[PDB]
Amino acid sequence: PLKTQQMQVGGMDCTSCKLKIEGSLERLKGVAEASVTVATGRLTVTYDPKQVSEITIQERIAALGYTLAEP
């Protein structure tokens, strides 16, 4: 019922950066799964297309000074 998706990413480290994505999204809306692929500069999400979707990750990546490219 929620669709799974991965983007490309401009600067997600692990050490203090995987965290700074993932544990905001839980407190965000419209997304209900996620996980990083730092080993390719990528982020995976699974989102429920009822309200907010890519937005959730745009707010979150831009609120850290980084760039995203979701297909």
Side-chain angles (χ1 to χ4, degrees):
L2 35 148
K3 289 189 177 176
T4 203
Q5 172 67 301
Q6 72 177 250
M7 71 214 71
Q8 194 164 276
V9 183
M12 267 59 258
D13 151 72
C14 183
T15 326
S16 282
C17 247
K18 72 167 269 81
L19 25 152
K20 301 189 306 203
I21 305 300
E22 289 158 312
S24 201
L25 306 181
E26 312 168 304
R27 305 98 208 295
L28 310 191
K29 288 55 167 180
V31 74
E33 306 155 26
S35 276
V36 307
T37 304
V38 164
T40 323
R42 293 189 191 176
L43 280 161
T44 305
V45 293
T46 318
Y47 47 34
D48 188 12
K50 292 183 183 74
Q51 271 188 358
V52 296
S53 181
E54 319 82 61
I55 311 304
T56 335
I57 343 171
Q58 193 173 102
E59 350 186 51
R60 183 30 33 183
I61 299 172
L64 297 173
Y66 292 97
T67 37
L68 80 172
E70 193 197 307

mmCIF file of all heavy atoms in Angstrom, residues 2-53:
data_model
loop_
_atom_site.group_PDB
_atom_site.id
_atom_site.type_symbol
_atom_site.label_atom_id
_atom_site.label_comp_id
_atom_site.label_asym_id
_atom_site.label_seq_id
_atom_site.Cartn_x
_atom_site.Cartn_y
_atom_site.Cartn_z
ATOM 1 N N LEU A 2 2.026 1.235 0.655
ATOM 2 C CA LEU A 2 3.097 2.210 0.492
ATOM 3 C C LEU A 2 4.129 1.693 -0.520
ATOM 4 O O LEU A 2 4.469 0.510 -0.548
ATOM 5 C CB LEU A 2 3.714 2.649 1.837
ATOM 6 C CG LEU A 2 3.801 1.577 2.928
ATOM 7 C CD1 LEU A 2 5.026 1.802 3.822
ATOM 8 C CD2 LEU A 2 2.549 1.593 3.826
ATOM 9 N N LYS A 3 4.612 2.581 -1.390
ATOM 10 C CA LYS A 3 5.567 2.285 -2.455
ATOM 11 C C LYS A 3 7.015 2.523 -2.045
ATOM 12 O O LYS A 3 7.326 3.533 -1.419
ATOM 13 C CB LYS A 3 5.237 3.148 -3.678
ATOM 14 C CG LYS A 3 3.951 2.621 -4.299
ATOM 15 C CD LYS A 3 3.668 3.291 -5.652
ATOM 16 C CE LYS A 3 2.412 2.689 -6.297
ATOM 17 N NZ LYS A 3 2.061 3.375 -7.568
ATOM 18 N N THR A 4 7.892 1.607 -2.460
ATOM 19 C CA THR A 4 9.328 1.666 -2.133
ATOM 20 C C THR A 4 10.110 2.291 -3.277
ATOM 21 O O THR A 4 9.735 2.162 -4.440
ATOM 22 C CB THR A 4 9.875 0.313 -1.672
ATOM 23 O OG1 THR A 4 11.025 0.531 -0.894
ATOM 24 C CG2 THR A 4 10.188 -0.665 -2.804
ATOM 25 N N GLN A 5 11.166 3.002 -2.908
ATOM 26 C CA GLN A 5 11.866 3.990 -3.720
ATOM 27 C C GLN A 5 13.278 4.193 -3.153
ATOM 28 O O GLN A 5 13.451 4.219 -1.933
ATOM 29 C CB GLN A 5 11.047 5.299 -3.673
ATOM 30 C CG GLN A 5 11.712 6.526 -4.315
ATOM 31 C CD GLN A 5 11.874 6.403 -5.828
ATOM 32 O OE1 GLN A 5 12.520 5.486 -6.322
ATOM 33 N NE2 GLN A 5 11.288 7.294 -6.605
ATOM 34 N N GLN A 6 14.284 4.394 -4.015
ATOM 35 C CA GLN A 6 15.598 4.872 -3.646
ATOM 36 C C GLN A 6 16.061 6.064 -4.499
ATOM 37 O O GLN A 6 15.941 6.062 -5.722
ATOM 38 C CB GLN A 6 16.606 3.720 -3.692
ATOM 39 C CG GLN A 6 17.010 3.184 -5.084
ATOM 40 C CD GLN A 6 18.069 2.074 -5.025
ATOM 41 O OE1 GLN A 6 19.229 2.238 -5.399
ATOM 42 N NE2 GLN A 6 17.717 0.892 -4.563
ATOM 43 N N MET A 7 16.655 7.064 -3.843
ATOM 44 C CA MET A 7 17.276 8.240 -4.466
ATOM 45 C C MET A 7 18.804 8.171 -4.454
ATOM 46 O O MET A 7 19.394 7.367 -3.731
ATOM 47 C CB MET A 7 16.801 9.507 -3.740
ATOM 48 C CG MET A 7 17.375 9.653 -2.333
ATOM 49 S SD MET A 7 16.236 10.443 -1.180
ATOM 50 C CE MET A 7 15.043 9.081 -1.044
ATOM 51 N N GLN A 8 19.441 9.085 -5.187
ATOM 52 C CA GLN A 8 20.865 9.393 -5.058
ATOM 53 C C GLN A 8 21.058 10.651 -4.193
ATOM 54 O O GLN A 8 20.139 11.455 -4.050
ATOM 55 C CB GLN A 8 21.457 9.513 -6.468
ATOM 56 C CG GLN A 8 22.990 9.507 -6.489
ATOM 57 C CD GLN A 8 23.487 9.240 -7.903
ATOM 58 O OE1 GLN A 8 23.586 8.101 -8.334
ATOM 59 N NE2 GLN A 8 23.760 10.257 -8.697
ATOM 60 N N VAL A 9 22.220 10.785 -3.550
ATOM 61 C CA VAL A 9 22.429 11.661 -2.388
ATOM 62 C C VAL A 9 23.825 12.280 -2.445
ATOM 63 O O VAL A 9 24.785 11.611 -2.822
ATOM 64 C CB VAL A 9 22.267 10.857 -1.076
ATOM 65 C CG1 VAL A 9 22.412 11.749 0.162
ATOM 66 C CG2 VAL A 9 20.893 10.173 -0.999
ATOM 67 N N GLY A 10 23.930 13.558 -2.067
ATOM 68 C CA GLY A 10 25.144 14.362 -2.255
ATOM 69 C C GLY A 10 26.179 14.313 -1.129
ATOM 70 O O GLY A 10 27.291 14.785 -1.347
ATOM 71 N N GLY A 11 25.852 13.778 0.059
ATOM 72 C CA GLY A 11 26.780 13.840 1.204
ATOM 73 C C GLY A 11 26.414 13.123 2.511
ATOM 74 O O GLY A 11 26.980 13.448 3.556
ATOM 75 N N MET A 12 25.501 12.148 2.485
ATOM 76 C CA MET A 12 25.246 11.245 3.622
ATOM 77 C C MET A 12 26.462 10.348 3.892
ATOM 78 O O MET A 12 26.615 9.272 3.321
ATOM 79 C CB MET A 12 23.972 10.419 3.393
ATOM 80 C CG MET A 12 22.715 11.072 3.985
ATOM 81 S SD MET A 12 22.283 12.730 3.387
ATOM 82 C CE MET A 12 22.855 13.752 4.763
ATOM 83 N N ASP A 13 27.283 10.804 4.833
ATOM 84 C CA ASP A 13 28.103 9.991 5.729
ATOM 85 C C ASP A 13 27.237 8.999 6.557
ATOM 86 O O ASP A 13 26.004 9.012 6.538
ATOM 87 C CB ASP A 13 28.961 10.979 6.566
ATOM 88 C CG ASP A 13 29.352 10.489 7.964
ATOM 89 O OD1 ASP A 13 30.213 9.583 8.068
ATOM 90 O OD2 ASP A 13 28.677 10.906 8.927
ATOM 91 N N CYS A 14 27.899 8.138 7.321
ATOM 92 C CA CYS A 14 27.290 7.230 8.286
ATOM 93 C C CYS A 14 27.370 7.845 9.693
ATOM 94 O O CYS A 14 26.327 8.169 10.271
ATOM 95 C CB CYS A 14 28.016 5.882 8.157
ATOM 96 S SG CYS A 14 27.257 4.668 9.269
ATOM 97 N N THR A 15 28.613 8.046 10.159
ATOM 98 C CA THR A 15 29.110 8.473 11.480
ATOM 99 C C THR A 15 28.220 9.475 12.194
ATOM 100 O O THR A 15 27.976 9.357 13.388
ATOM 101 C CB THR A 15 30.516 9.081 11.310
ATOM 102 O OG1 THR A 15 31.226 8.423 10.283
ATOM 103 C CG2 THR A 15 31.338 8.965 12.593
ATOM 104 N N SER A 16 27.707 10.460 11.474
ATOM 105 C CA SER A 16 26.703 11.406 11.942
ATOM 106 C C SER A 16 25.933 11.995 10.757
ATOM 107 O O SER A 16 25.999 13.201 10.514
ATOM 108 C CB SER A 16 27.343 12.474 12.842
ATOM 109 O OG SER A 16 27.567 11.947 14.135
ATOM 110 N N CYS A 17 25.176 11.147 10.032
ATOM 111 C CA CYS A 17 24.482 11.514 8.785
ATOM 112 C C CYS A 17 23.423 10.504 8.356
ATOM 113 O O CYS A 17 22.295 10.937 8.118
ATOM 114 C CB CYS A 17 25.483 11.826 7.661
ATOM 115 S SG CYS A 17 25.415 13.581 7.198
ATOM 116 N N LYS A 18 23.697 9.189 8.395
ATOM 117 C CA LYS A 18 22.615 8.200 8.238
ATOM 118 C C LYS A 18 21.496 8.484 9.256
ATOM 119 O O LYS A 18 20.345 8.733 8.886
ATOM 120 C CB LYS A 18 23.118 6.735 8.273
ATOM 121 C CG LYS A 18 23.588 6.118 9.601
ATOM 122 C CD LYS A 18 23.752 4.587 9.553
ATOM 123 C CE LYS A 18 22.489 3.807 9.970
ATOM 124 N NZ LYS A 18 21.471 3.672 8.903
ATOM 125 N N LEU A 19 21.908 8.652 10.522
ATOM 126 C CA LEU A 19 21.049 8.982 11.650
ATOM 127 C C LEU A 19 20.215 10.227 11.406
ATOM 128 O O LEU A 19 19.005 10.230 11.604
ATOM 129 C CB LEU A 19 21.839 9.163 12.966
ATOM 130 C CG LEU A 19 23.334 9.559 12.921
ATOM 131 C CD1 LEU A 19 23.682 10.321 14.210
ATOM 132 C CD2 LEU A 19 24.237 8.322 12.820
ATOM 133 N N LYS A 20 20.876 11.295 10.966
ATOM 134 C CA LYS A 20 20.247 12.604 10.841
ATOM 135 C C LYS A 20 19.138 12.641 9.782
ATOM 136 O O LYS A 20 18.286 13.530 9.848
ATOM 137 C CB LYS A 20 21.323 13.654 10.514
ATOM 138 C CG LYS A 20 22.468 13.795 11.528
ATOM 139 C CD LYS A 20 23.380 15.006 11.240
ATOM 140 C CE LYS A 20 23.941 15.030 9.806
ATOM 141 N NZ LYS A 20 25.191 15.817 9.690
ATOM 142 N N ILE A 21 19.147 11.701 8.828
ATOM 143 C CA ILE A 21 17.997 11.391 7.973
ATOM 144 C C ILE A 21 16.979 10.575 8.757
ATOM 145 O O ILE A 21 15.909 11.098 9.074
ATOM 146 C CB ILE A 21 18.412 10.698 6.647
ATOM 147 C CG1 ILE A 21 19.447 11.516 5.848
ATOM 148 C CG2 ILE A 21 17.163 10.403 5.791
ATOM 149 C CD1 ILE A 21 18.967 12.915 5.444
ATOM 150 N N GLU A 22 17.313 9.310 9.027
ATOM 151 C CA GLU A 22 16.356 8.240 9.306
ATOM 152 C C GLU A 22 15.490 8.576 10.529
ATOM 153 O O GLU A 22 14.262 8.547 10.428
ATOM 154 C CB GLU A 22 17.128 6.907 9.456
ATOM 155 C CG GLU A 22 17.700 6.394 8.110
ATOM 156 C CD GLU A 22 18.879 5.419 8.258
ATOM 157 O OE1 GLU A 22 19.812 5.727 9.033
ATOM 158 O OE2 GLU A 22 18.972 4.407 7.513
ATOM 159 N N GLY A 23 16.102 9.032 11.634
ATOM 160 C CA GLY A 23 15.371 9.354 12.871
ATOM 161 C C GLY A 23 14.732 10.732 12.887
ATOM 162 O O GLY A 23 14.241 11.162 13.926
ATOM 163 N N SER A 24 14.701 11.441 11.760
ATOM 164 C CA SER A 24 13.708 12.499 11.593
ATOM 165 C C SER A 24 12.431 11.955 10.951
ATOM 166 O O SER A 24 11.359 12.229 11.483
ATOM 167 C CB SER A 24 14.273 13.650 10.777
ATOM 168 O OG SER A 24 13.542 14.841 11.015
ATOM 169 N N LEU A 25 12.541 11.193 9.850
ATOM 170 C CA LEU A 25 11.433 10.623 9.079
ATOM 171 C C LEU A 25 10.399 9.860 9.920
ATOM 172 O O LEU A 25 9.213 10.009 9.652
ATOM 173 C CB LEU A 25 11.987 9.677 8.004
ATOM 174 C CG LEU A 25 13.050 10.207 7.025
ATOM 175 C CD1 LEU A 25 13.436 9.103 6.031
ATOM 176 C CD2 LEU A 25 12.580 11.448 6.257
ATOM 177 N N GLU A 26 10.828 9.115 10.949
ATOM 178 C CA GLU A 26 9.905 8.447 11.886
ATOM 179 C C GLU A 26 8.923 9.435 12.534
ATOM 180 O O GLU A 26 7.754 9.131 12.747
ATOM 181 C CB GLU A 26 10.658 7.804 13.066
ATOM 182 C CG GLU A 26 11.893 6.936 12.797
ATOM 183 C CD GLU A 26 12.615 6.683 14.126
ATOM 184 O OE1 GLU A 26 12.967 7.693 14.787
ATOM 185 O OE2 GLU A 26 12.753 5.518 14.544
ATOM 186 N N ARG A 27 9.425 10.626 12.878
ATOM 187 C CA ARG A 27 8.620 11.719 13.440
ATOM 188 C C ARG A 27 7.954 12.590 12.357
ATOM 189 O O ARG A 27 7.104 13.439 12.676
ATOM 190 C CB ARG A 27 9.454 12.542 14.441
ATOM 191 C CG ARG A 27 10.075 11.667 15.554
ATOM 192 C CD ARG A 27 11.540 11.299 15.262
ATOM 193 N NE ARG A 27 11.972 10.021 15.854
ATOM 194 C CZ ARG A 27 12.093 9.647 17.118
ATOM 195 N NH1 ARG A 27 11.778 10.434 18.124
ATOM 196 N NH2 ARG A 27 12.550 8.438 17.357
ATOM 197 N N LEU A 28 8.325 12.401 11.084
ATOM 198 C CA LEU A 28 7.615 12.961 9.936
ATOM 199 C C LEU A 28 6.393 12.106 9.586
ATOM 200 O O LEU A 28 5.996 11.204 10.318
ATOM 201 C CB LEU A 28 8.538 13.262 8.737
ATOM 202 C CG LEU A 28 9.801 14.077 9.069
ATOM 203 C CD1 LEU A 28 10.520 14.557 7.804
ATOM 204 C CD2 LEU A 28 9.549 15.305 9.963
ATOM 205 N N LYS A 29 5.670 12.538 8.564
ATOM 206 C CA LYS A 29 4.385 11.969 8.146
ATOM 207 C C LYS A 29 4.527 11.363 6.737
ATOM 208 O O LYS A 29 5.487 11.646 6.031
ATOM 209 C CB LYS A 29 3.325 13.095 8.193
ATOM 210 C CG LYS A 29 2.888 13.575 9.598
ATOM 211 C CD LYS A 29 4.025 14.044 10.522
ATOM 212 C CE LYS A 29 3.609 14.810 11.774
ATOM 213 N NZ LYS A 29 4.829 15.179 12.538
ATOM 214 N N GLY A 30 3.609 10.496 6.301
ATOM 215 C CA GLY A 30 3.471 10.074 4.896
ATOM 216 C C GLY A 30 4.435 8.975 4.473
ATOM 217 O O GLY A 30 4.083 8.123 3.676
ATOM 218 N N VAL A 31 5.621 8.969 5.054
ATOM 219 C CA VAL A 31 6.580 7.857 4.993
ATOM 220 C C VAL A 31 6.395 6.952 6.219
ATOM 221 O O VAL A 31 6.072 7.445 7.301
ATOM 222 C CB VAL A 31 8.024 8.376 4.829
ATOM 223 C CG1 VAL A 31 8.589 8.998 6.115
ATOM 224 C CG2 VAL A 31 8.950 7.264 4.328
ATOM 225 N N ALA A 32 6.570 5.638 6.045
ATOM 226 C CA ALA A 32 6.397 4.653 7.125
ATOM 227 C C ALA A 32 7.462 3.539 7.157
ATOM 228 O O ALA A 32 7.540 2.832 8.160
ATOM 229 C CB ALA A 32 4.971 4.093 7.058
ATOM 230 N N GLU A 33 8.312 3.413 6.132
ATOM 231 C CA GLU A 33 9.592 2.700 6.207
ATOM 232 C C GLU A 33 10.701 3.592 5.646
ATOM 233 O O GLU A 33 10.450 4.445 4.794
ATOM 234 C CB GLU A 33 9.622 1.437 5.346
ATOM 235 C CG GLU A 33 8.498 0.439 5.605
ATOM 236 C CD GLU A 33 8.206 -0.441 4.381
ATOM 237 O OE1 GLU A 33 9.128 -0.635 3.552
ATOM 238 O OE2 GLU A 33 7.048 -0.890 4.247
ATOM 239 N N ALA A 34 11.948 3.303 6.009
ATOM 240 C CA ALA A 34 13.114 3.824 5.298
ATOM 241 C C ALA A 34 14.381 2.990 5.594
ATOM 242 O O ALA A 34 14.371 2.154 6.498
ATOM 243 C CB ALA A 34 13.332 5.303 5.674
ATOM 244 N N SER A 35 15.494 3.262 4.902
ATOM 245 C CA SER A 35 16.868 2.833 5.252
ATOM 246 C C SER A 35 17.934 3.417 4.304
ATOM 247 O O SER A 35 17.737 3.496 3.093
ATOM 248 C CB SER A 35 17.025 1.300 5.278
ATOM 249 O OG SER A 35 16.617 0.765 6.523
ATOM 250 N N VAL A 36 19.113 3.780 4.818
ATOM 251 C CA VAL A 36 20.212 4.283 3.963
ATOM 252 C C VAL A 36 20.948 3.193 3.162
ATOM 253 O O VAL A 36 21.140 2.074 3.638
ATOM 254 C CB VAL A 36 21.257 5.112 4.738
ATOM 255 C CG1 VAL A 36 20.655 6.259 5.564
ATOM 256 C CG2 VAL A 36 22.173 4.232 5.613
ATOM 257 N N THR A 37 21.496 3.603 2.005
ATOM 258 C CA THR A 37 22.536 2.906 1.225
ATOM 259 C C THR A 37 23.691 3.887 1.002
ATOM 260 O O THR A 37 23.970 4.353 -0.103
ATOM 261 C CB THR A 37 21.970 2.346 -0.085
ATOM 262 O OG1 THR A 37 20.880 1.517 0.222
ATOM 263 C CG2 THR A 37 22.975 1.480 -0.855
ATOM 264 N N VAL A 38 24.361 4.223 2.104
ATOM 265 C CA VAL A 38 25.547 5.113 2.159
ATOM 266 C C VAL A 38 26.665 4.600 1.243
ATOM 267 O O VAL A 38 27.351 5.396 0.609
ATOM 268 C CB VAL A 38 26.071 5.263 3.613
ATOM 269 C CG1 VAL A 38 27.490 5.844 3.739
ATOM 270 C CG2 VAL A 38 25.109 6.130 4.438
ATOM 271 N N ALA A 39 26.776 3.276 1.085
ATOM 272 C CA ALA A 39 27.716 2.594 0.192
ATOM 273 C C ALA A 39 27.497 2.860 -1.317
ATOM 274 O O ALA A 39 28.132 2.208 -2.148
ATOM 275 C CB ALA A 39 27.639 1.096 0.520
ATOM 276 N N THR A 40 26.597 3.777 -1.697
ATOM 277 C CA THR A 40 26.420 4.236 -3.087
ATOM 278 C C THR A 40 26.009 5.714 -3.125
ATOM 279 O O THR A 40 25.657 6.220 -4.184
ATOM 280 C CB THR A 40 25.408 3.338 -3.830
ATOM 281 O OG1 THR A 40 25.551 1.993 -3.435
ATOM 282 C CG2 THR A 40 25.606 3.337 -5.348
ATOM 283 N N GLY A 41 25.992 6.405 -1.974
ATOM 284 C CA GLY A 41 25.401 7.737 -1.822
ATOM 285 C C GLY A 41 23.924 7.699 -2.195
ATOM 286 O O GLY A 41 23.499 8.427 -3.092
ATOM 287 N N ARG A 42 23.157 6.812 -1.546
ATOM 288 C CA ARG A 42 21.733 6.599 -1.813
ATOM 289 C C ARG A 42 20.914 6.479 -0.522
ATOM 290 O O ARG A 42 21.411 6.040 0.517
ATOM 291 C CB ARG A 42 21.537 5.353 -2.700
ATOM 292 C CG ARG A 42 22.098 5.524 -4.118
ATOM 293 C CD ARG A 42 21.682 4.364 -5.024
ATOM 294 N NE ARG A 42 22.425 4.406 -6.294
ATOM 295 C CZ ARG A 42 22.352 3.508 -7.269
ATOM 296 N NH1 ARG A 42 21.485 2.511 -7.242
ATOM 297 N NH2 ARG A 42 23.164 3.616 -8.302
ATOM 298 N N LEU A 43 19.628 6.825 -0.599
ATOM 299 C CA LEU A 43 18.652 6.643 0.485
ATOM 300 C C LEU A 43 17.446 5.878 -0.044
ATOM 301 O O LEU A 43 16.923 6.262 -1.090
ATOM 302 C CB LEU A 43 18.208 8.024 1.014
ATOM 303 C CG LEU A 43 19.200 8.687 1.984
ATOM 304 C CD1 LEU A 43 18.941 10.193 2.079
ATOM 305 C CD2 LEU A 43 19.062 8.069 3.367
ATOM 306 N N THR A 44 17.003 4.837 0.669
ATOM 307 C CA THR A 44 15.760 4.107 0.393
ATOM 308 C C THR A 44 14.676 4.584 1.349
ATOM 309 O O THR A 44 14.926 4.770 2.539
ATOM 310 C CB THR A 44 15.972 2.596 0.533
ATOM 311 O OG1 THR A 44 17.044 2.196 -0.292
ATOM 312 C CG2 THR A 44 14.755 1.773 0.108
ATOM 313 N N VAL A 45 13.462 4.739 0.835
ATOM 314 C CA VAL A 45 12.239 4.962 1.618
ATOM 315 C C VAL A 45 11.127 4.039 1.134
ATOM 316 O O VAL A 45 11.129 3.640 -0.034
ATOM 317 C CB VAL A 45 11.733 6.419 1.567
ATOM 318 C CG1 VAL A 45 12.712 7.377 2.266
ATOM 319 C CG2 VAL A 45 11.440 6.891 0.135
ATOM 320 N N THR A 46 10.149 3.772 2.003
ATOM 321 C CA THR A 46 8.807 3.351 1.541
ATOM 322 C C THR A 46 7.725 4.299 2.056
ATOM 323 O O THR A 46 7.535 4.450 3.268
ATOM 324 C CB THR A 46 8.486 1.894 1.891
ATOM 325 O OG1 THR A 46 9.606 1.064 1.669
ATOM 326 C CG2 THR A 46 7.352 1.288 1.077
ATOM 327 N N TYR A 47 7.010 4.929 1.116
ATOM 328 C CA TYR A 47 6.034 6.001 1.375
ATOM 329 C C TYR A 47 4.570 5.711 0.967
ATOM 330 O O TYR A 47 4.262 5.113 -0.065
ATOM 331 C CB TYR A 47 6.543 7.354 0.830
ATOM 332 C CG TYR A 47 7.129 7.454 -0.582
ATOM 333 C CD1 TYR A 47 6.652 6.665 -1.650
ATOM 334 C CD2 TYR A 47 8.126 8.418 -0.850
ATOM 335 C CE1 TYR A 47 7.121 6.857 -2.960
ATOM 336 C CE2 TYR A 47 8.611 8.613 -2.161
ATOM 337 C CZ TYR A 47 8.092 7.846 -3.228
ATOM 338 O OH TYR A 47 8.503 8.064 -4.508
ATOM 339 N N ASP A 48 3.639 6.189 1.790
ATOM 340 C CA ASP A 48 2.192 6.073 1.628
ATOM 341 C C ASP A 48 1.648 7.314 0.888
ATOM 342 O O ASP A 48 1.660 8.413 1.458
ATOM 343 C CB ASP A 48 1.542 5.907 3.017
ATOM 344 C CG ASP A 48 0.048 5.595 2.928
ATOM 345 O OD1 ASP A 48 -0.440 5.292 1.817
ATOM 346 O OD2 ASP A 48 -0.663 5.622 3.959
ATOM 347 N N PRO A 49 1.192 7.183 -0.376
ATOM 348 C CA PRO A 49 0.945 8.313 -1.278
ATOM 349 C C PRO A 49 -0.386 9.037 -0.999
ATOM 350 O O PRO A 49 -1.046 9.520 -1.918
ATOM 351 C CB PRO A 49 1.036 7.705 -2.685
ATOM 352 C CG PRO A 49 0.479 6.298 -2.478
ATOM 353 C CD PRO A 49 1.046 5.929 -1.110
ATOM 354 N N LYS A 50 -0.809 9.107 0.268
ATOM 355 C CA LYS A 50 -2.065 9.748 0.675
ATOM 356 C C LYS A 50 -1.948 11.262 0.931
ATOM 357 O O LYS A 50 -2.970 11.942 0.916
ATOM 358 C CB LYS A 50 -2.608 9.041 1.931
ATOM 359 C CG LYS A 50 -3.063 7.601 1.651
ATOM 360 C CD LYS A 50 -3.661 6.973 2.920
ATOM 361 C CE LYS A 50 -4.056 5.503 2.716
ATOM 362 N NZ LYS A 50 -2.863 4.627 2.660
ATOM 363 N N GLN A 51 -0.756 11.800 1.228
ATOM 364 C CA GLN A 51 -0.580 13.184 1.666
ATOM 365 C C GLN A 51 0.784 13.745 1.237
ATOM 366 O O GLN A 51 0.844 14.478 0.259
ATOM 367 C CB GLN A 51 -0.771 13.251 3.193
ATOM 368 C CG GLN A 51 -2.229 13.491 3.627
ATOM 369 C CD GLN A 51 -2.379 13.741 5.127
ATOM 370 O OE1 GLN A 51 -1.438 13.706 5.904
ATOM 371 N NE2 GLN A 51 -3.580 13.998 5.599
ATOM 372 N N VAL A 52 1.858 13.415 1.962
ATOM 373 C CA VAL A 52 3.247 13.822 1.688
ATOM 374 C C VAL A 52 4.067 12.576 1.359
ATOM 375 O O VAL A 52 3.758 11.486 1.833
ATOM 376 C CB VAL A 52 3.883 14.637 2.843
ATOM 377 C CG1 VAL A 52 3.145 15.972 3.033
ATOM 378 C CG2 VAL A 52 3.920 13.872 4.175
ATOM 379 N N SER A 53 5.073 12.740 0.503
ATOM 380 C CA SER A 53 5.809 11.646 -0.141
ATOM 381 C C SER A 53 7.291 12.053 -0.245
ATOM 382 O O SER A 53 7.939 12.181 0.791
ATOM 383 C CB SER A 53 5.110 11.347 -1.473
ATOM 384 O OG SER A 53 5.715 10.294 -2.187
#
